[PDB]
Structure formats: structure tokens, C-alpha cells
Amino acid sequence: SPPAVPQTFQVAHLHAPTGSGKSTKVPAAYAAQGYKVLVLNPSVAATLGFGAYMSKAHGIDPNIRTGVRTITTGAPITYSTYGKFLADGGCSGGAYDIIICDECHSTDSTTILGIGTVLDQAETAGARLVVLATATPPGSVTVPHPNIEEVALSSTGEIPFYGKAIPIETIKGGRHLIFCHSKKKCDELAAKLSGLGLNAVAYYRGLDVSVIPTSGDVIVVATDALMTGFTGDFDSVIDCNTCVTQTVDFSLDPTFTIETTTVPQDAVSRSQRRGRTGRGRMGIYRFVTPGERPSGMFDSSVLCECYDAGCAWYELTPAETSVRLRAYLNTPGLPVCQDHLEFWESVFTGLTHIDAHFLSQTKQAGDNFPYLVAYQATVCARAQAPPPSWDQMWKCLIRLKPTLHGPTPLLYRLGAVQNEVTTTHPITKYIMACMS
DNA sequence: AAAAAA
């Protein structure tokens, strides 16, 4: 049933629903034929999760590789995240015959870099086959779910949402899940509902899952934050149909601008959110918008994230990162994006002699674009100049604040800029030149 | 305007 292992090296696609067999059954089969298999997954919890199931399901303790915990068993099957895979330097010389790239539809920087690394090192590493598995191939469109009945919203309601309202009785009793785009609006919506006597709580990246009562009436207003260690299944799901993403704009003021904005959800988003209900029983899905943008596309800002991660985490030169990204963008059947490898590469190539301390800080802070942040900070300190602003993203320069004065040598815009700006800095001129 | 993995 699973893709046949070719005599020579080949890259195969695995389009199939139900996120289970593709990461358990498929690999279990290959191993039965005496093959060494590597299964990569974006999630750490998922990767650790497959370890426990494989044992009890196929009586074979697979190897587990994640940033937190690593476990070797010599077994023919190894489960690992893309992150951990990258940190391990990629494909080991002759370690696996088949490499499975699960959730290959994910457009996050780590997965794209990961898959691109596989597509470039697989064959040489000795692998005989690469599998790009996903339940939602590029260009997918949400399909009506059996145990789920979708219903639109209207002005009819006492709780304003995103252009509409939500009936009080619609969520009066039972367990419900409300999806909001912003983390602050989650606390707002939850505030009102809970204020109306309703038992509503907010959830997002940071708060522990223990906040949501495993039983009893409750309304959860959360973001797309993964509820690791929590049995989903909700009587209904109200979705705002909006996703928060980062977009890049070549505003030439003086160079580029990376900002996080909103945007209508795509098939994947819609599917995943609507999937939190209708598990084993009839569920409901209340939306604010009927349409949906086709899945399979990601912004150029993501490639920028790849070069940043290659620089900050995986000790990859800009050119090296390009090899792996070039392989990704040259492989059909995967998420597409405007080819800006050359431009992004040239940008990062000029970002030399970064302050190790600042880099360490931005990385440890778990901030976005830690490399670009730390580098801007480096230029600022090197010029005894203040950062673009004193927003939390520049906190690595706080101890130097007393001695920083004058215009910020702006290299690019990563958020709001409060301080005065100058564009005379050599690195800024270099970047301006790349824009051409 | 969020999340996630290094």
C-alpha cells in the first residue's frame, strides 16, 4: 500500500487523510521489509507521541530525537522533529534508506529548512527514497466533515465577534471552543462572556493547559496554540476565520519592512480549527466567513526566517542555506513562495561580525528573527546609537541605554520605529544596494 | 495583531 522503494533514489508524495497511519503504519511497514526509516515531524509532542504508540502498537521502541529528550534503541525506526534533525547536521552518512517528511504542508521556517535539507542530502546520504506525506496537499480546500455540521453567524446575538455576533444560548451550556486571532482579544472576549456569568477562560502560548477544566461546562477562547496534553472534543467551535502572519514589504525606507499582520485563514487553518469538534460525536462549526484561501503558499518573510535560523541556530552560511532552500523550491508538490533566495542571501551575507552576546540573548529570548535583531543591536552599540525603539524586542541593549544617543542606524524595520533614523551606515547602504 | 523549533 505505501510508496514502493525504488532501486535508485527517488522522491515520492504521500497524499492521504487521517494523521496516524502516515506516521505510524507506513514506517512500521517499511521496517518490516528490513528498511531503516526516519520520520520527521514539526511538533515535539507529536514526535514524542509516536514513540509511545509505536511500542504498544508494533512492539518496537523507536529512536526518539528532540531538542529536549533523546532516546536511542538501535531500532530501525527513528522519530525526530525537523528542528532536532537540523541541529544534528542533517542526513547522517548512510543511516536511513527511507526518510519520511510528515506534515510536509507546514510553512513554518523550521519545516521548510528541514525538508529542504532532506531533499538535498538524502540521496548522497545513501537514502533510497524520500516521502513527502501530508493530509492537506498544496491547493487543498476544506471539505464537509461527517460528524461536523457547519453554521454561519449573523448580527443576531448579544456578543459581538468579527463583524457578527454570538447568541448567548449558543454557548450557554456545554463545552465550547472560540478561536480569536489576537491574544489580547482572547482575554477581552473571555472577559465579557465570563462577565455574563458564563464559565469562560482564555488560552494561548504561555498559559498551562491545566487552565481549561477537563470536564464540566466551559467556554475556551484561545488562539491556534497547541493544547499539548489535553483531550479536545468540544460541542461546538466558533472561528473568527483570521490568522496572524508575518509579511515582508520592500518599502525602501530605507530597505525593507517585516511586520506581523492578519489575513483570512486558508484551508489548513480552517480545517484544523473546525477539527477540534465532531470527534466521535456530532459537532458544530460556527464561522464568520464562508470562503477560504487555498492552502499551499507562504510569504517571502518566511525564507528570511530560514536564513536567520541558519545563521543563528544551525551554523549555516547564507549560501549553504540557499542550497537547502533551492532544493525545496525546486521540488513540485510542495508549498510555493516567490523566489527570493538570491536577494535574502545577499542580505545576510553582509551581516558579519555579529555580537555573540546579543545573538545569545535574542535566541534565548525566543524572539522572531533573532539574528536580524541581534545584528541591528550590534550596529547600534557599535555606533553608541539607540535602537529603533525600547519595545521588548530590543531589551538586549537595555544595559547600554545610558550611553546610547542620536539617530538609530536603521538597517531595516522589524516593528515600529520610535527613535530618529539615519541611513548613512555602511550596512544600510549595502542592504539598499541589494534591493537593486 | 500568534505559534513553534532549533
Curated annotation (Swiss-Prot):
Record-listed ATP binding positions: 16-23
Cofactor names: Zn(2+); Mg(2+)
Compartments, record wording: Host endoplasmic reticulum membrane
Cofactor notes: Binds 1 zinc ion which has a structural role. The magnesium ion is essential for the helicase activity.
Reaction catalysed by this enzyme: Hydrolysis of four peptide bonds in the viral precursor polyprotein, commonly with Asp or Glu in the P6 position, Cys or Thr in P1 and Ser or Ala in P1'; a ribonucleoside 5'-triphosphate + H2O = a ribonucleoside 5'-diphosphate + phosphate + H(+); ATP + H2O = ADP + phosphate + H(+)
Membrane topology: Peripheral membrane protein
Residues binding Mg(2+) 1, per UniProt: 23, 103
Residue ranges of domain Helicase ATP-binding in the record: 3-155
Motif stretch (DECH box): 102-105
UniProt domain comment: The N-terminal one-third of serine protease/helicase NS3 contains the protease activity. This region contains a zinc atom that does not belong to the active site, but may play a structural rather than a catalytic role. This region is essential for the activity of protease NS2, maybe by contributing to the folding of the latter. The NTPase/helicase activity is located in the twothirds C-terminus of NS3, this domain contains the NTPase and RNA-binding regions.
Subunit structure, interactors included: Interacts with protease NS2. Interacts with non-structural protein 4A; this interaction stabilizes the folding of NS3 serine protease. NS3-NS4A interaction is essential for NS3 activation and allows membrane anchorage of the latter. NS3/NS4A complex also prevents phosphorylation of host IRF3, thus preventing the establishment of dsRNA induced antiviral state. Interacts with host MAVS; this interaction leads to the cleavage and inhibition of host MAVS. Interacts with host TICAM1; this interaction leads to the cleavage and inhibition of host TICAM1.
Protein name: Serine protease/helicase NS3
Lineage, highest ranks first: Viruses, Riboviria, Orthornavirae, Kitrinoviricota, Flasuviricetes
